[PDB]
From Swiss-Prot:
Induction: By drugs, such as rifampicin. The lineage of its organism: Eukaryota, Metazoa, Chordata, Craniata, Vertebrata. Activated by cytochrome b5. Its EC number is 1.14.14.1, 1.14.14.56, 1.14.14.73, 1.14.14.55. This is Cytochrome P450 3A4. GO terms for molecular function: 1,8-cineole 2-exo-monooxygenase activity; 1-alpha,25-dihydroxyvitamin D3 23-hydroxylase activity; anandamide 11,12 epoxidase activity; anandamide 14,15 epoxidase activity; anandamide 8,9 epoxidase activity; caffeine oxidase activity; enzyme binding; estrogen 16-alpha-hydroxylase activity. GO terms for biological process: aflatoxin metabolic process; alkaloid catabolic process; androgen metabolic process; cholesterol metabolic process; estrogen metabolic process; lipid hydroxylation; lipid metabolic process; long-chain fatty acid biosynthetic process. InterPro entries: Cyt_P450, Cyt_P450_CS, Cyt_P450_E_CYP3A, Cyt_P450_E_grp-II, Cyt_P450_sf, Cytochrome_P450_3A. Its main location: endoplasmic reticulum. Interacts with PGRMC1; the interaction requires PGRMC1 homodimerization. The keyword Iron applies. SUPFAM superfamilies: Cytochrome P450.
Amino acid sequence: THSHGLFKKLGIPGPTPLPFLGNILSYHKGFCMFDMECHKKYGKVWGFYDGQQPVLAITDPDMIKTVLVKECYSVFTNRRPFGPVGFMKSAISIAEDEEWKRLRSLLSPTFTSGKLKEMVPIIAQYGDVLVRNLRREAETGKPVTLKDVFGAYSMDVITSTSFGVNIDSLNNPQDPFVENTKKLLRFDFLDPFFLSITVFPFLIPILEVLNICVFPREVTNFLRKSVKRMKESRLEDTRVDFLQLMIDSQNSHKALSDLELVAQSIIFIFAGYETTSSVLSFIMYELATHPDVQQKLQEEIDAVLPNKAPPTYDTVLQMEYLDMVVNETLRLFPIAMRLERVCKKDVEINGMFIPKGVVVMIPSYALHRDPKYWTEPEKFLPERFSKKNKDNIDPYIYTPFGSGPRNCIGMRFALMNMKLALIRVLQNFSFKPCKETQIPLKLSLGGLLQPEKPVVLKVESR
Ligand code: HEM
Ligand SMILES: O=C(Nc1ccccc1Cl)Nc1cc(C(F)(F)F)ccc1-n1ccnc1
């Protein structure tokens, strides 16, 4: 069509596109598979079309450095729009250009290491809540789905970190916080809706004026009113909360708005609910099929934390083998699967012309399983990140949280929240592969990096 000849005139390889659709039909196996194939059959740089949108994939570590870090503020500043957002336009992950830079500057102190030390005790409380619910699940003698026990833990952590709501989600699934935020799941960009707007981006403004938001409107309105209630109730009571830290910044760039505060509060829930639980389920599955790693980690946890001691910020950063298990699992399963930046101007990077409007993509999943930089990439060898071998890895081929000024702002929080859970559960429980567990676990063919079947494992007291 009009823009389907852009990659041919630049001498860039890629799958031949079909009219009105581009290469969306090649998504029959999902983004992860499709990127790995195009890597094998085209080399280091290739291109494809999401409808009429040209997407350029780069794998050179220097080019990834230029896009994500070097020329970030100048050229590659924003991600591609993904649908009708409504008032959630002010979310930091959705904000663009000057709005994003202000929001990140006014929200960066919220994710300091010092503020994280102050949040460890609160996250610790629901680690003990997790084992109690896990004790009953283990005594039943039946396999346990890890997605639900971790989702309950992640929900409990989010409600206590973002707000002052202290709830046991597993046994109290009736609080309006628990019910509405339970629907804040990841986006399957290969479902009929997101596929349709990817081929029909012209329908996004139509959806917006219909007040059709990508997020559930009932959940957003409830959470906005809840913050309005809490903001008044916190004043009447006159704290360690993502909200309170934002309140303590609003009263003292230019400023942060009341609606902006609500928007960022919801995005923290959206960025943390399933992502933490999904990675936690992935981590425990890999420990069950490789008990040697599970044994050494359990021994290391007992060494740093004798007599089932409670974890502390400093002790968590001390445990090395736990950091190795988390990193290697993220290498096998980068749940973002991709990193995207929009080229706002005509620019040349590392001797390559990038015309304005092209979406530049970094295939995180494809790079993390590339035989070039990784040895036996299909295996779970957590020793790759040993202190001696933790330098050979290129920090721009392994990008689980992204890189540059637009990386995951909650990387330290997520890593601490995940590790705090892993210490408590492993030092009390051991996990064995039940029959229903798929030993060669298969990944889903949709837009999410999730297993084909929910991971079920046998759990027992230690
Ligand atoms: C283990 C779970 C998580 C993983 C694997 C993950 C990964 C990522 C990735 C790959 C990005 C895109 C970075 C890039 O484009 O350069 C991102 C962005 C972001 N994440 Fe996370 N994330 C996780 C959890 C969280 C949590 C719990 C929070 C909230 C406390 C959070 C807050 C954010 C924000 C605010 C951004 C956008 C930052 C920006 O646009 O400037 N993430 N994350
Ligand atoms: O852009 C993303 N990539 C991603 C990261 C982790 C897991 C899965 C994915 Cl696909 N995720 C994202 C998107 C939004 C937006 F929909 F508002 F754009 C808001 C928050 C996050 N997010 C999740 C975890 N950390 C950040």
